[PDB]
Amino acid sequence: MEMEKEFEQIDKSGSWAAIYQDIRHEASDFPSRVAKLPKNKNRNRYRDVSPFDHSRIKLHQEDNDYINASLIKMEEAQRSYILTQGPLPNTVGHFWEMVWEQKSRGVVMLNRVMEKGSLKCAQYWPQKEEKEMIFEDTNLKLTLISEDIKSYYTVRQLELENLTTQETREILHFHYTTWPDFGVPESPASFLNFLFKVRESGSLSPEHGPVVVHCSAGIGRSGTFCLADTCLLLMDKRKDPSSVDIKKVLLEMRKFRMGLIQTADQLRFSYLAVIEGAKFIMGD
Ligand SMILES: COc1ccc(CN)cc1OC
């Protein structure tokens, strides 16, 4: 089934929980042996969210190449994304190693450091220009260069440097700060706007390494971001709404990382965002 008639038709029954639960049953299940090894226990923020072994990103440090991060490769769209958990205090360093290795231009953050009174992520970036960060055991220094704080999001320009070698890179930090503590936003417009900024930056483009995307577990809000982006690009490819099938795209994405889209409320919101973002895409 166009997706908005289908939307209308799901919305007037209440098959969302119904549809969601169906995706869950048919999703891929692949092994995660590396994530589960003893030595790696302290590198996982959550027990039940692990990267599969076939798509996990691997550090270049022979010693322990483990990070909770997955490469989501979308062949047709010529899009790749790295989805990862919010860094722990002890993996902060790992996180910036990955970025550097993979040649990413942008980092997309969809959570706040504290939510519902608890801590969801380490503070992995510098808050003032004059107070730069150096990691342990990593040989990297991160410097805040500038920020631009708006009402729904904040964009930071950052400088990442290799101390061993002296190489410098500009990294852009796209931080969506207004996702509510419970549920999903009322309107997707702010989220669509944020997506487009990221896209306008060059961060999602093929000439660079994959964008690094994360929330607390790196599957829910993060899945919403990558799903909508891809569905819309597919929409530009051949200018055709009915041709793009969101459910099938979501299952394909779930071959690379487990659990993408955590609630049925998040699936409805994904649907919402695409239908509406689709009224850019088709020439308006
Ligand atoms: C940049 O190049 C492309 C990127 C994406 C698509 C996606 N269908 C096609 C492209 O060819 C030009």
The 8-class DSSP code of residue 51 comes to: B
Q: Is 266 left (phi over 0), alpha (psi -120 to 50) or beta?
A: alpha
Give the max Cα distance, the chain: 60
How is 103-171 classified by DSSP, letter by letter? T--EEEE-S-SEETTEE-S---S-SSTTS-EE-SSS-EEEEEEEEEE-SSEEEEEEEEEETTT--EEEE
**Determination method here?**
X-ray
Identity (one letter) of the amino acid at 92?
V
The alpha carbon of 82 and the centre of ligand 1 are apart by a number of angstroms equal to 19
The 8-class DSSP code of residue 196 comes to: H
What are phi and psi for residue 42, nearest 5 degrees?
-85, 0
Distance CA 256, CA 29 (A): 10
1-6, long-range: CB < 8 A, 24+ apart: 2/241, 2/242, 3/241, 3/242, 3/244, 3/246, 3/271, 3/274, 3/275, 4/275
Is 209 known to sit in a ligand binding site? no
Judge whether 231 counts as a catalytic residue.
no
Angle between helices 264-281 and 221-238 (to 10 degrees): 30
The alpha carbon of 88 and the centre of ligand 1 are apart by a number of angstroms equal to 36
Q: Into how many domains does the chain fold?
A: 1
**Could you give the 3-state DSSP secondary structure of residue 221?**
helix
Q: Which helix (H) or strand (E) holds 73?
A: strand 66-74
Residues of the domain holding 172: 1-284
Q: Is 239 left (phi over 0), alpha (psi -120 to 50) or beta?
A: left
Q: What is the CATH number of the domain that holds 152?
A: 3.90.190.10
Is 221 known to sit in a ligand binding site? yes
Distance CA 237, CA 78 (A): 11
- Listed by the residue before each break, gaps in the chain with C–N over 2.5 Å are 1
The token pair at 6 is 């289908």
Q: What is the resolution of this structure in A?
A: 1.7
Strands 153-162, 140-149: pairing kind: antiparallel
Options 121, 215, 226, 231, the catalytic residue: 215
CA-nearest of 272, 257, 284 to 46 is 257
Is 9 known to sit in a ligand binding site? no
Distance CA 212, CA 235 (A): 23
